Amino acid sequence: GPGDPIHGHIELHPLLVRIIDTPQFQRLRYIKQLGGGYYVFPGASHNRFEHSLGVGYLAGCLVHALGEKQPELQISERDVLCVQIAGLCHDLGHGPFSHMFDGRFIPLARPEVKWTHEQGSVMMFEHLINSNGIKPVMEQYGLIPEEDICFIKEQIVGPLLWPYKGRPENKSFLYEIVSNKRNGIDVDKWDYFARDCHHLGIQNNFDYKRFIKFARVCEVDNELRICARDKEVGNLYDMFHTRNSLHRRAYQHKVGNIIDTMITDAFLKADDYIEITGAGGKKYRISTAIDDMEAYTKLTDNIFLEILYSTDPKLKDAREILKQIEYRNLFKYVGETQPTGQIKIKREDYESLPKEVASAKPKDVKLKAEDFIVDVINMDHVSFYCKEQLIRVYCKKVDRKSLYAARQYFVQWCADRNFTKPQD
Amino acid sequence: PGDPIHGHIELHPLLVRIIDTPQFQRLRYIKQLGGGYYVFPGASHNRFEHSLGVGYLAGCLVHALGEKQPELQISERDVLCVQIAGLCHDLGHGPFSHMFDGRFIPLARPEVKWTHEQGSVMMFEHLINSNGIKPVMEQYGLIPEEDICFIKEQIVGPLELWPYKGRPENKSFLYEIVSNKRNGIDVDKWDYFARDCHHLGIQNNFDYKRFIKFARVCEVDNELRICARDKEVGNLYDMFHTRNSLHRRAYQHKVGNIIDTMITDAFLKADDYIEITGAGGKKYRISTAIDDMEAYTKLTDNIFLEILYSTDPKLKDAREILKQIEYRNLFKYVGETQPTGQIKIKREDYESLPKEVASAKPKVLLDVKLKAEDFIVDVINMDHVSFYCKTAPNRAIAEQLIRVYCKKVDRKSLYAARQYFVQWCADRNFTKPQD
Ligand SMILES: [Zn+2]
Ligand SMILES: [Zn+2]
């Protein structure tokens, strides 16, 4: 019977539904989960809204199961609701086309500002419960707004000696359910592994239900962690194999990421000329709407069509790129390298990379920085019990004589930067 | 990574030329089940993927009929045409698919007869004209004059003894592949059965591959039709059971259709104030963009957010309804009736129905008066297949329901609304509603 294709019919707590039936939350119906993936995989039409519901539901399943199996952990009806709301809201902060936006646009548009989508999820959440008087409703259901709002934000963004103020250290395991940076395993990934496979037509053999059934809390170096039964390791292999498959075959897809950087090139050439209306009446730009949640609420995938359909001559440059995509005259792939050693090209350095490439004296045609797009692309210690970064360059010039030239600058840049030699 | 239903499909270069086109790319922004998304989180698919599927499926079937029966003389040209027809049959869908030609246009412009297939045919003509596809068809063995006719025809049926001008009667079976109004079975339905189930989380047991493998053409009353092996009837039951399930459980979903009528109420209250730019510079309205394909190309699901995010005070009324939906203060369900054994409700009559309901004097005098503006009434509409035996091949072996909603949500008003409704059914001779 018609429900979520992955979790089926989920029924939620009235508090959870209050949070959902909200414009700050509904906002997620208009954010492609895999962003520019849609333009390469027809199946991938899902948005963060469904995903978010998934993670909320899954967060609850796990906490509630840990509770039943181990009453000694003293997991409360309150603790559960909090974890659910955290899973529910962890993605509130995603901007147009998901990771493309905090990952590439903002660092190109505003290199000085450190902005992450989780920061945004925390502001967006605060603004959500403020603009909808959710606080009186939390109190109604046994929540302590002061202590718990802290707890919720904390499990979304980490700490804002024992770092956290939302829960004591003896309930530390609750901080590994929605976001687990250490062991990679959280209910967040479980959901999006399941649906990215479901829409990409990829085999997914991980069984989170089985995993949840056999999960437990236990001491690991005098610290409480979520462990998995040893006889559950074959299921864990099946997960990581899926993670590796979604990555190798979809998230790193050659043309898929090319398109992503074109869409970003469109937004940039349009940033000056699109006004988003914020609090008070004040107007913001795409890149700057992150400064006010009133406006950010209205910054979704819509912005793409707003440019596409525009008639403004100021926006002709942007329109033309978005029109490149419909026709499929994409930027041309020039090659791939990765940094040897430890170093990762830092986000603040993105804006300058094309200036660098274009300045590389190779050992016919001259190319300028405007002709190069370079995008940086980034991404077994689990506990049991018994009963990196790759750089691709594209060229905006599509003629044979220019690509040969572009490859020449690229190979040299890798040379005098000490990145791995590209493959012919 | 490919289509989750057909996997990796590779298409003819002509097909790709048609696809890499703004008139076609338009379909990336039309929710397949329209207002279904706001009730089933899974249903985020658009007509673009669907269209590709039907294109691909149209080809599979034609090409298979061809190999099994060379005597039918099915050409490389005949195949390409059927593929393009399947590929373009949905070009004319407007914002939120069926919600638009089925309800908005009949409320917005009751005088005009508009169907989405008409629009698919104009949109297609405009597509191959705006992208110089015709020189490319000739390049691949197509006869633009004869074939463009053929394509349009299998999308909209005869544009006017043997009705069609695109193909002779001896290749009549080609006209039952993409759109089959008679027996219900076409590759169109097969695709959207498969993906509506795939996104709705519904079991779909029909196996179109098996069906395609055992399909054949054969004489049925001196007419060439596509028949199915008799031993394929259990697969056919599995199909119809899925059709009925997608209908009972999803396409007729109580709250799903309510939301659809609110979105329609929003577009209507916004129709005056949104301008769409067409050919020449001329400006059109939502309801009127169907008169010019330049503008229609730019009429997609975007129009929804354009209203939602709008700051215009003229558009405050519309905004408020779309905001009703985010908050989930929906119109309230009042009841269901059908016109069993009565004359059905024609599309031209939709605009007048609320005036009727509101004018129905109920038997007992009611503590509240309601006006037409307070009622939303929506009309909701929707085994003779031919078989053959291995032995002797080549020869063959509800309708409309009306629901009423109320825009007033207080208890004392709903009770009133139900009263008008029950009476309207009375003096209209529709079935008595269920308590
Ligand atoms: Zn997530
Ligand atoms: Zn269709």
From Swiss-Prot, chain B:
Effect listed in the UniProt record for changing G92S: In AGS5; does not affect oligomerization; decreased ability to restrict LINE-1 retrotransposon activity; does not affect localization to nucleus
Molecular function as annotated in GO: deoxynucleoside triphosphate hydrolase activity; dGTP binding; dGTPase activity; GTP binding; identical protein binding; nucleic acid binding; RNA binding; RNA nuclease activity
Reported tissue expression: Expressed in heart, skeletal muscle, spleen, liver, small intestine, placenta, lung and peripheral blood leukocytes. No expression is seen in brain and thymus.
Known outcome of mutating H93A: Abolished dNTPase activity without affecting homotetramerization
Effect of H247A: Abolishes dNTPase activity
Impact when changing R26A: Abolished ability to restrict infection by viruses
Result of altering Y192A: Abolished ability to restrict infection by viruses. Abolishes dNTPase activity. Does not affect ability to promote DNA end resection at stalled replication forks
Assigned EC number: 3.1.5.-
Consequence of substituting H50Y: In AGS5; loss of function in defense response to virus; loss of oligomerization; decreased ability to restrict LINE-1 retrotransposon activity
Top-level taxon in the UniProt lineage: Eukaryota
Gene Ontology CC terms, in alphabetical order: nucleoplasm; nucleus; plasma membrane; site of double-strand break; tetraspanin-enriched microdomain
Record's catalysed reaction(s): a 2'-deoxyribonucleoside 5'-triphosphate + H2O = a 2'-deoxyribonucleoside + triphosphate + H(+); dATP + H2O = 2'-deoxyadenosine + triphosphate + H(+); dCTP + H2O = 2'-deoxycytidine + triphosphate + H(+); dGTP + H2O = 2'-deoxyguanosine + triphosphate + H(+)
Result for mutant: Q25 to E/A: Impairs homotetramerization and nearly abolishes dNTPase activity
Binding site for Mn(2+): H50, H89, D90, D188
Cofactor(s) listed in the protein's UniProt record: Mn(2+)
Keywords: Acetylation, Aicardi-Goutieres syndrome, Allosteric enzyme, Antiviral defense, Chromosome, Disease variant, DNA damage, DNA repair, DNA replication, GTP-binding, Host-virus interaction, Hydrolase, Immunity, Innate immunity, Isopeptide bond, Metal-binding, Nucleotide-binding, Nucleus, Phosphoprotein, Ubl conjugation, Zinc
Chain residues that bind dATP 2: V39, R210, R229, K231, N235, H253, K254, K390
Effect of Q400A: Loss of function in defense response to virus. Does not affect oligomerization. Retains dNTPase activity
Function field: Protein that acts both as a host restriction factor involved in defense response to virus and as a regulator of DNA end resection at stalled replication forks. Has deoxynucleoside triphosphate (dNTPase) activity, which is required to restrict infection by viruses, such as HIV-1: dNTPase activity reduces cellular dNTP levels to levels too low for retroviral reverse transcription to occur, blocking early-stage virus replication in dendritic and other myeloid cells. Likewise, suppresses LINE-1 retrotransposon activity.
Name of this chain's protein: Deoxynucleoside triphosphate triphosphohydrolase SAMHD1
